[PDB]
Design a protein around this ligand. Structure first.
Ligand SMILES: *C(=N)C1(NC(=O)[C@H](CC(C)(C)F)N[C@@H](c2ccc(-c3ccc(S(C)(=O)=O)cc3)cc2)C(F)(F)F)CC1
Length: 215
């Protein structure tokens, strides 16, 4: 693996979205990972539809929350996921409105990073593309993040409560980090992004529930 990777520089990452009041972080994380793979395989960067996942993944809970792996499994079984343009995000759960005519990506399964293993997570990011990850994002320190590499000793890996997207990793002024795309809009963090401590004893549980789709 390279010392640093940033998939934004390769055009693998769509603009930061805002999930609003709906608990659809998992859907944004999932589409982000699918978007990276779609770009890598086909050359196309496009917004995929988190609404498609919110409404149609029966083993998730819509705006009540969900798992990224359930979303990948759905896309595989469904034989597709719609584009954002074809199935727009409305910020609350609707009836399933999937239409194969608006299909923009497929999924051939998924893979899980060995739990707790940041080296494996780094290898996955390097070899595959953006990876879906789960973190404890409950702390005010996370809410108020602005610059530098984020670390809070109170972050609790038993409290995985938020899904985001690891789009790269590197080092800033000697501090190793993960480059994380959030779905809280561009006015949160650094234009919607946060640098989170890497190789610091699995800070915030970042390597505890990481996964990526096959395509
Ligand atoms: C995101 N806005 C949000 N967090 C989550 O959705 C998190 C994300 C992780 C996976 C930590 F990255 N997941 C939560 C969650 C997972 C599953 C369900 C769920 C409930 C009920 C059903 S059902 C309809 O009864 O089959 C299915 C799935 C809810 C929440 C977490 F609890 F953290 F695991 C804040 C919401």
């Amino acid at each position: 693996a390279p010392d640093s990777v940033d998939y934004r520089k390769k055009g693998y990452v769509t603009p930061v979205k805002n999930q609003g009041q709906c608990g659809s972080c998992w859907a944004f994380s999932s589409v982000g990972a699918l978007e990276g793979q779609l770009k890598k395989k086909t050359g196309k960067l496009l917004n995929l539809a988190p609404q498609n996942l919110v409404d149609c993944v029966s083993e998730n809970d819509g705006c009540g929350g969900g798992y990224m792996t359930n979303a990948f499994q759905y896309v595989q079984k469904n034989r597709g996921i719609d584009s954002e343009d074809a199935y727009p995000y409305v910020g609350q759960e609707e009836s399933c409105m999937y239409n194969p005519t608006g299909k923009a990506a497929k999924c051939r399964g998924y893979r899980e990073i060995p739990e707790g293993n940041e080296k494996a997570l780094k290898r996955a990011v390097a070899r595959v593309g953006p990876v879906s990850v789960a973190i404890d994002a409950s702390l005010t320190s996370f809410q108020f993040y602005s610059k530098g590499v984020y670390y809070d000793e109170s972050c609790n890996s038993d409290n995985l409560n938020h899904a985001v997207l690891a789009v790269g990793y590197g080092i800033q002024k000697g501090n190793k980090h993960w480059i994380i795309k959030n779905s809280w809009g561009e006015n949160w963090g650094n234009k919607g992004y946060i640098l989170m401590a890497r190789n610091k004893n699995n800070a915030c549980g970042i390597a505890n529930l990481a996964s990526f789709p096959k395509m």
